[model samples]
Target: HQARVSKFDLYNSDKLDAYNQEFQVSRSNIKSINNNGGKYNSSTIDKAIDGNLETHWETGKPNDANFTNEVVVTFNEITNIDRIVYSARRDSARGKGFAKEFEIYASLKDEGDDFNLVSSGEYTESTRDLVEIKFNPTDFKRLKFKFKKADQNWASAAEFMFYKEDKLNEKFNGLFTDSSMNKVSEEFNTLEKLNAFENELKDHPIYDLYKEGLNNARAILTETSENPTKATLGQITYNLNDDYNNQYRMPYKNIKAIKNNGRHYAAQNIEKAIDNDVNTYWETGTLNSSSFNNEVEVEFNDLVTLDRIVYGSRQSDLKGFAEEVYIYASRTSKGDTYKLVATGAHEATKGLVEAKFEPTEFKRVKFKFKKSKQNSATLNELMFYKP
Candidate 1:
């Protein structure tokens, strides 16, 4: 029998899900971390891999003004690694406290062994973008990151993520090969049909507006080719409404904000709406009726073309599910001058309801609460898909 893998798994091939799953049990042996102890705080080495960006490994409080400090990560056993992602602290202004230049080294044996330099490079001057570097697969039990320079006297490193070799790079390059092009002939034909549509509508009264939309769609494809990181299986990106509610589906942990006009009921807060779990829920305060225009809004970190939305009614109070809602999208965060994309109804059941609309580029999405079966409005989860 063939194995049945979730479609969502295939969509996130760029991530290290399979690697993490395969090594999770063994990776627990990450035993020790050491660094040039922080000047202010004694030892903050653990902050580098604690999974929280706010914490970091920094030089001593009177921070070493020189480039001599270094940090090392030691594992219990020899491990094969292919990728390393380093993040720099971003709490300050451009170049402040950031590690401007660094060198990475690896040792196959335990500590005190001969460490060989594997990679060296400079990070972005202003942005805190995760610096991803890939190396030929190598076995190592210890990894060292040597800081060569910092923008300020205080040098700090936010996080370090290691991954076993993955085939995504190989598979991504294959997409542009001749064999893959041949396999996608039908898709190319469909694009040609879209070109015909552009030509047919060229003489319409709103031709300029329609043409502009077409051009934007084309640009998304072009941009994906230029920056492959922006392209996923379906070109979909997901973000959690809150930093604490992070998961594989909601990978981004730095959320700006998610606001709702309704007050919380019980412990269910608005952040629960995007927690990626169907068990938890966000229940609005008891209302005379669900007819009040109580609305919830979500803003993304960047502009994206929203294609679909999936939502579930509160599991415990299914009757409080939204029966009818108006979905709106906007290019701005304030939601001013937003456009209605779709109006949909949800069943008063525990299952999720999905609504698909024409792809619209927006930085924010708003859901206007309308009629519900019960007096209160509640939601178990919400997901936004972009393409």
Candidate 2:
């Protein structure tokens, strides 16, 4: 009777043991954290959504430009998500920071940039069980668990779960899988018998590693074809290890959008440091000085070549980093005018400090935060590249 074919073995199958109840709910809500740290107890990012998967949520070295880990949750009213269980980190020196690659966003408007990714995959089960992320029913109150890849540093979530938006109980509707209700293994759901057994390994050399693992299983089946997840279900067996690349690099995503100064800081949304989307950032509500009151200016819809300028670090370090910066650039004055060009510093260590210069071109660009280690200024990313 050895033939189960994963989904963590049909989610602990026994045919779900006579329709086991509590299909899901832990009320996901990590408030507003940058990277909730804790692994040696007393750590709090609300214990990774605190449904008690064994208390977890740790992140210490991320934000070195774009390794920025994330966690933003909330749902008590607009809730309806169907499945999102990621419970790795059970202690005894657990598999380092679990979220083996993730992305799930939602929005009912919690703050600018309209979160709507809906879902993404990958969770090669790193033990402590449960990695389910099936999706379909959408409802939101601002969920955003963006852990962009991690399994050995910068990933930990004892629990970050949910699932109350379920269906398929017409007597288990043919016993599962009407879109990840997960339970269908009526054996060999063949596609021309898996295309004649993959064309008998096309003159077999293991068919070039079986089309290189079928091109990452056809890019997680075209990125969940509009956000479907069951980790895009794959693998009957694989062991080429180290190049299973499931996807999620998004370097500036396409980079090219910088327009801040429309005014916004209290809720920290100056187009998240320039909307190029490195998982969104921008921090500075108050308390910032060495002399420039945390000045932020970008204002450019056209001319913006850029030479270099970077100042990073965030996640509620509560104003720390951005100690001595003063860069300015302009083409025709959008503000009170500018032209200083370069002068940066931020080495107190959250990692990432820049001010390179020499490619200069702009419509406007401003920084001026003379100093701040704790006077207040916590930008997760404020980059300007050009060499």
Candidate 3:
């Protein structure tokens, strides 16, 4: 039947439920973020840990005697983490309150100042990216950041993200924004489940987006180090769900057509072009020249609005496919007053040749075909789709 797809019940509650089970992630379950309340600005403490790079939360100046300028990220439970993503305030002057040096401590409990010192570093990067700080995998629920120095007299943090021992395969909460919106709520841990999830949505509109996510996921998960921040993992799934939930596609319908040109190539009649069978076809049957005037015409069963057309070669060769073609739509049943809708040449590619034109309602459609070289090019199946 021309391998054509028909109307689909796009909204499926069951599929949504299933997909949510695999994509939702929350590996380093951050329970709460507490700033030492020593910040210089009143820009809420949540802004620093908000995972967004735009807003920043400020803290008091550094002290050598007792580092009071601090921010604590506490997890719901002890998570073994090896990397932390930190970004400086990104506004006004680029270096405003950007960290110059910092120290990190991991605590088994959220107790103040009882954390063990794990890593210390001098921050120099100016890029707005959530830069990473790789350290020995430390087991702790609360990660306390103690600012030692800042570019200016202030210390600030715009965002802080964390990843497990394997940043590439870290599972993260897919919560993008908690509003009246969709969330990627699955954590596909196994390759088996990931592959299965991919195959299950081949026909979905988000398939392209999902395919891209799959490729990125596969490549990242198999890598040794994180190229982009692991935070990008959730972003990918978030987009997939976003595209799926908000996707809009016109329910396409194939318009029925029949041969209008009274011509035949031996037993291969013009009817072959409209037979709804990709296995059968009608060749151009060109006279002397293959790249010249040879045409095929078809009349729809009923006047319909069409925006796209598709045709293909017979199974093994392009003997039935047109390289160059012109399409015209007509309102008359006798195929007169043809108005040109589209004119183009198909690339030398296998499989289906699909083209789109301005939406037109007509009873008859004519195709003027030509090929660069051929014994007799063909049109295996000529189909029209409504907008």
Assess each prediction's global lDDT (C-alpha) against the native. 0.60, 0.54, 0.57
lDDT by residue (1-387, candidate 1, tens digit) is 111111112223443444455433244667677776454364277877776656666667423654366788888888787666666664554234565666778898775859898777665535355555566666778988777776665667677666676553333323222531222223223456547656765544334534434443333233211111111112122333354223223333423578788788889898998777778888887563534666888877766676666677787768567777777766543413355766766557666765666666656678766677665677787776544
Candidate 2, superposed: residue stretches over 4 Å from native: 1-41, 46-55, 58-83, 93-107, 111-127, 137-141, 144-193, 196-387
Tell me the deviation in Å of residue 290 in model 3: 62
Candidate 1: give the clashing pairs: 38-60, 39-60, 39-61, 40-61
Q: Tell me the TM-score of each prediction against the true structure.
A: 0.40, 0.20, 0.36
Candidate of highest TM-score: 1
Clash number for candidate 1: 4
Error of 2 at 255 (Å): 53
lDDT tens digits by residue: candidate 3, 58-116: 76544445554778888898888766667778787555665566778889986656888
- Compute the lDDT of residue 208 as modeled in candidate 1: 51
The numbered model that scores best in lDDT is 1
Sort every candidate by lDDT, greatest first.
Answer: 1, 3, 2
Candidate 1 displacement at residue 139 in angstroms: 1.1
Give the winner by lDDT: 1 or 3: 1
Please report, as a residue range, the 10-residue window in candidate 1 with the lowest summed lDDT.
Answer: 224-233
